[PDB]
Design a protein around this motif. Sequence first.
Motif, PDB file in Angstrom:
ATOM      1  N   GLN A  12       0.823  -1.202   0.000  1.00  0.00           N
ATOM      2  CA  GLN A  12       0.000   0.000   0.000  1.00  0.00           C
ATOM      3  C   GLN A  12       0.861   1.257   0.000  1.00  0.00           C
ATOM      4  OE1 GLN A  12      -2.691   1.877   3.239  1.00  0.00           O
ATOM      5  NE2 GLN A  12      -3.919   0.189   2.434  1.00  0.00           N
ATOM      6  N   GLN A  13       2.039   1.177   0.604  1.00  0.00           N
ATOM      7  CA  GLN A  13       2.923   2.330   0.653  1.00  0.00           C
ATOM      8  C   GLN A  13       3.526   2.554  -0.725  1.00  0.00           C
ATOM      9  OE1 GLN A  13       1.539   1.036   4.147  1.00  0.00           O
ATOM     10  NE2 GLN A  13       1.731   3.027   3.161  1.00  0.00           N
ATOM     11  N   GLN A  14       3.969   1.463  -1.336  1.00  0.00           N
ATOM     12  CA  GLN A  14       4.398   1.488  -2.726  1.00  0.00           C
ATOM     13  C   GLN A  14       3.225   1.868  -3.627  1.00  0.00           C
ATOM     14  OE1 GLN A  14       6.348   0.328  -0.616  1.00  0.00           O
ATOM     15  NE2 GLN A  14       7.860  -1.135  -1.360  1.00  0.00           N
ATOM     16  N   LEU A  15       2.011   1.606  -3.152  1.00  0.00           N
ATOM     17  CA  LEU A  15       0.813   1.924  -3.919  1.00  0.00           C
ATOM     18  C   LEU A  15       0.588   3.422  -3.937  1.00  0.00           C
ATOM     19  CD1 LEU A  15      -1.760  -0.925  -3.283  1.00  0.00           C
ATOM     20  CD2 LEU A  15       0.335  -0.836  -4.613  1.00  0.00           C
ATOM     21  N   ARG A  26      -5.449   0.245  -7.824  1.00  0.00           N
ATOM     22  CA  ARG A  26      -4.898  -0.480  -6.690  1.00  0.00           C
ATOM     23  C   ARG A  26      -4.649  -1.930  -7.045  1.00  0.00           C
ATOM     24  NH1 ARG A  26      -4.406   4.007  -4.338  1.00  0.00           N
ATOM     25  NH2 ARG A  26      -2.878   3.952  -6.045  1.00  0.00           N
ATOM     26  N   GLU A  27      -5.658  -2.549  -7.640  1.00  0.00           N
ATOM     27  CA  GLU A  27      -5.551  -3.911  -8.156  1.00  0.00           C
ATOM     28  C   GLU A  27      -4.260  -4.101  -8.946  1.00  0.00           C
ATOM     29  OE1 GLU A  27      -9.422  -2.956 -10.085  1.00  0.00           O
ATOM     30  OE2 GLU A  27      -9.922  -5.005  -9.494  1.00  0.00           O
ATOM     31  N   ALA A  28      -4.073  -3.288  -9.983  1.00  0.00           N
ATOM     32  CA  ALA A  28      -2.904  -3.399 -10.842  1.00  0.00           C
ATOM     33  C   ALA A  28      -1.626  -3.109 -10.066  1.00  0.00           C
ATOM     34  CB  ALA A  28      -3.025  -2.459 -12.031  1.00  0.00           C
ATOM     35  N   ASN A  29      -1.631  -1.992  -9.336  1.00  0.00           N
ATOM     36  CA  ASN A  29      -0.504  -1.582  -8.505  1.00  0.00           C
ATOM     37  C   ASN A  29       0.001  -2.734  -7.634  1.00  0.00           C
ATOM     38  OD1 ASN A  29      -1.660   0.832  -9.525  1.00  0.00           O
ATOM     39  ND2 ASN A  29      -1.083   2.020  -7.724  1.00  0.00           N
ATOM     40  N   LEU A  30      -0.842  -3.231  -6.732  1.00  0.00           N
ATOM     41  CA  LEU A  30      -0.384  -4.232  -5.773  1.00  0.00           C
ATOM     42  C   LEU A  30      -0.218  -5.609  -6.410  1.00  0.00           C
ATOM     43  CD1 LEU A  30      -3.319  -5.523  -5.389  1.00  0.00           C
ATOM     44  CD2 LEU A  30      -3.505  -4.045  -3.392  1.00  0.00           C
ATOM     45  N   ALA A  35       3.784  -9.911  -7.676  1.00  0.00           N
ATOM     46  CA  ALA A  35       4.761 -10.664  -8.453  1.00  0.00           C
ATOM     47  C   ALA A  35       6.179 -10.119  -8.276  1.00  0.00           C
ATOM     48  CB  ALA A  35       4.377 -10.695  -9.921  1.00  0.00           C
ATOM     49  N   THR A  36       6.304  -8.917  -7.720  1.00  0.00           N
ATOM     50  CA  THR A  36       7.622  -8.344  -7.472  1.00  0.00           C
ATOM     51  C   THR A  36       7.999  -8.409  -5.984  1.00  0.00           C
ATOM     52  OG1 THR A  36       6.694  -6.108  -7.269  1.00  0.00           O
ATOM     53  CG2 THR A  36       7.452  -6.808  -9.455  1.00  0.00           C
ATOM     54  N   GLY A  37       6.998  -8.598  -5.124  1.00  0.00           N
ATOM     55  CA  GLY A  37       7.232  -8.744  -3.692  1.00  0.00           C
ATOM     56  C   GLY A  37       7.748  -7.476  -3.034  1.00  0.00           C
ATOM     57  N   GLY A  38       7.285  -6.322  -3.505  1.00  0.00           N
ATOM     58  CA  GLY A  38       7.672  -5.073  -2.886  1.00  0.00           C
ATOM     59  C   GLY A  38       8.712  -4.355  -3.703  1.00  0.00           C
ATOM     60  N   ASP A  39       8.927  -4.852  -4.910  1.00  0.00           N
ATOM     61  CA  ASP A  39       9.894  -4.256  -5.809  1.00  0.00           C
ATOM     62  C   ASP A  39       9.132  -3.302  -6.671  1.00  0.00           C
ATOM     63  OD1 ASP A  39      11.567  -3.676  -8.166  1.00  0.00           O
ATOM     64  OD2 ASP A  39      12.884  -5.262  -7.417  1.00  0.00           O
ATOM     65  N   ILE A  40       8.999  -2.100  -6.171  1.00  0.00           N
ATOM     66  CA  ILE A  40       8.129  -1.131  -6.771  1.00  0.00           C
ATOM     67  C   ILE A  40       8.649  -0.699  -8.125  1.00  0.00           C
ATOM     68  CG2 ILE A  40       9.115   1.036  -5.915  1.00  0.00           C
ATOM     69  CD1 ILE A  40       6.700   1.930  -7.083  1.00  0.00           C
ATOM     70  N   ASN A  41       9.945  -0.842  -8.315  1.00  0.00           N
ATOM     71  CA  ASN A  41      10.572  -0.485  -9.568  1.00  0.00           C
ATOM     72  C   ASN A  41      10.020  -1.380 -10.660  1.00  0.00           C
ATOM     73  OD1 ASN A  41      12.991   0.830  -7.848  1.00  0.00           O
ATOM     74  ND2 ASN A  41      12.820  -1.333  -7.292  1.00  0.00           N
ATOM     75  N   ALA A  42      10.078  -2.681 -10.403  1.00  0.00           N
ATOM     76  CA  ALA A  42       9.559  -3.662 -11.330  1.00  0.00           C
ATOM     77  C   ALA A  42       8.038  -3.597 -11.378  1.00  0.00           C
ATOM     78  CB  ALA A  42      10.030  -5.057 -10.951  1.00  0.00           C
TER      79      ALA A  42
END
Length: 53
Positions: A12-15, A26-30, A35-42
């Motif tokens: 949610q923070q990366q969101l 949100r759906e797409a974001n999270l 699939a990235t596990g918190g890798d907001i870059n990817a």
Amino acid sequence: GPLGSMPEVRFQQQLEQLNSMGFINREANLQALIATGGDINAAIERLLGSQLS
């Protein structure tokens, strides 16, 4: 023991971060963060790269 089994504590923070990037699905974001596990870059690169329409 800090629970990583609380995905939105990362997601949610990366969101909000993607939220800043014009990504408010949100759906797409999270899902990207799933699939990235918190890798907001990817996560972003999945939203930019993986847009299968």
